[PDB]
Design a protein around this ligand. Structure first.
Ligand code: HEM
Ligand SMILES: C=C1/C(=C\C=C2/CCC[C@]3(C)[C@@H]([C@H](C)CCCC(C)(C)O)CC[C@@H]23)C[C@@H](O)C[C@@H]1O
Length: 401
């Protein structure tokens, strides 16, 4: 027999908004942890329950150090992370905090509120272009990706002019299946960001990157390579996550036409619906890799120092002890406390920006294209595999022209 007690991980979605069969199995298995086998044949733990996920994401014994030999890399591409200085996503206290604090001013509640008119302007701008061209469009390339790309570019002070280049490099890096393809795309982005830094040293400019160059870099409080990594982190997260959420959300809402109509009829529901969609879709479900620096006992199971642990937030967000009937989309439910953005010191920096963008996007689509529908069968869409940010690279849509 082929039965194993350490199943291959990650697994692929076969339905854009449902756990892969293997994740459903792990969700159903009693206890906080379960053994898996990574791509290289090393075993690691996955965390498969909601409260245990919060506990372990809060445990300083679980390091985010992606350079550790025992870090649970889920594919060969991750070499692109371990081969350069880490952005703060890969740091632990105290270095984590000193780096994260250099960026937090761009993401304050007050700043997010202040970006509402810009995000609304950008959303409607790309809509009026898409709709003026008329039906059979790819929602990914024409809307889902350019909108948050333009927004994060202004926040960072990266020229939107260069979008074709950095969007292509972003995709190759994040979606690469092999180490050399990842290293190249990372190197391409690095050289670009490097030139931007030098440009800012000659002529000060707006945006976070400009601010970091003029201040912390000039004081030697951040390494040039760290600034590159930090900018690359924010550029890619700023783009890809919201893009993925937009496309997946349209697919999922259109498969739930009853709740979609309800959303349209009562816009006060959109913020809650956005939380439910974040819970349900969990697009960064394997962005929870850690390595134990010390033994950790977990409800009778022992994680040993030097063992890898992945906090699987998709599985955790389907914990029925927390979300009653967890596999049912319900935009009226309280999706509060979900783990789509992590928990603790590395909890998503961009979360409130994501929430603003998705609220504006949903309202705009319902306002401007109420007859939006997919132009192909859900079954014919190609879903990205489990080793990356979840989503689709193409989304054929049409509407009443
Ligand atoms: C749109 C949906 C998004 C999802 C589902 C999401 C998910 C996550 C998750 C699960 C983590 C934690 C990773 C860990 O614990 O190792 C994270 C961290 C992070 N995310 Fe988000 N993200 C989203 C949007 C954004 C946006 C729009 C940005 C803007 C740049 C952003 C920036 C970051 C950064 C900088 C971190 C690292 C925080 C730290 O390590 O201190 N994210 N995200
Ligand atoms: C942007 C950065 C870089 C790489 C990001 C990648 C490449 C590999 C796969 C990653 C890490 C994606 C995976 C979905 C996350 C898998 C996480 C894990 C290995 C724990 O299951 C998200 C972003 C992707 C390069 C780094 O130098 C700066 C910044 O860091």
């Amino acid at each position: 027999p082929q039965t194993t007690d350490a199943p291959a991980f990650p697994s692929n979605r076969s339905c854009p908004y449902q756990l892969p069969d293997g994740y459903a199995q792990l969700r159903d298995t009693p206890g906080p942890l379960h053994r898996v086998t990574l791509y290289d044949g090393r075993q690691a733990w996955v965390v498969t329950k909601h409260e245990a996920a919060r506990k372990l994401l809060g445990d300083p014994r679980l390091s985010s150090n992606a350079t550790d030999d025992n870090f649970p890399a889920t594919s060969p591409a991750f070499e692109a992370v371990r081969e350069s200085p880490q952005a703060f996503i890969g740091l632990d206290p105290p270095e984590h905090g000193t780096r994260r604090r250099m960026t937090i001013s761009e993401f304050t509640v007050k700043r997010i509120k202040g970006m509402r008119p810009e995000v609304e302007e950008v959303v409607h701008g790309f809509l009026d272009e898409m709709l003026a061209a008329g039906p059979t469009a790819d929602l990914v390339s024409q809307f889902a990706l350019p909108v948050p790309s333009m927004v994060i570019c202004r926040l960072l002070g990266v020229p939107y002019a260069d979008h074709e280049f950095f969007q292509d490099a972003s995709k190759r890096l994040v979606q690469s299946t092999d180490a050399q393809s990842a290293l190249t795309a990372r190197n391409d982005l690095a050289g670009y960001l490097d030139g931007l830094i030098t440009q800012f040293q000659t002529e000060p400019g707006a945006g976070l990157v400009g601010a970091l160059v003029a201040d912390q870099l000039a004081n030697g409080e951040i390494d040039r390579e760290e600034l590159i990594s930090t900018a690359m982190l924010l550029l890619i997260a700023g783009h890809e996550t919201t893009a993925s959420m937009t496309s997946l959300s349209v697919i999922t809402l259109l498969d739930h036409p009853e709740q979609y109509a309800a959303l349209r009829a009562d816009r006060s529901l959109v913020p809650g619906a956005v939380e439910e969609l974040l819970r349900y879709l969990a697009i960064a479900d394997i962005a929870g890799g850690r390595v134990a620096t010390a033994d950790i006992e977990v409800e009778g199971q022992l994680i040993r120092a030097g063992e890898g642990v992945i906090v699987v937030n998709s599985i955790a967000n389907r914990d029925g002890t927390v979300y009653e009937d967890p596999d049912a989309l319900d935009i009226h439910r309280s999706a509060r406390h979900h783990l789509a953005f992590g928990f603790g010191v590395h909890q998503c920096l961009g979360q409130n920006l994501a929430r603003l963008e998705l609220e504006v996007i949903l309202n705009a689509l319902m306002d401007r294209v109420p007859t939006l529908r997919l132009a192909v069968p859900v079954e014919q869409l190609v879903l990205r595999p489990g080793t990356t940010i979840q989503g689709v690279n193409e989304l054929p849509v049409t509407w009443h022209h």
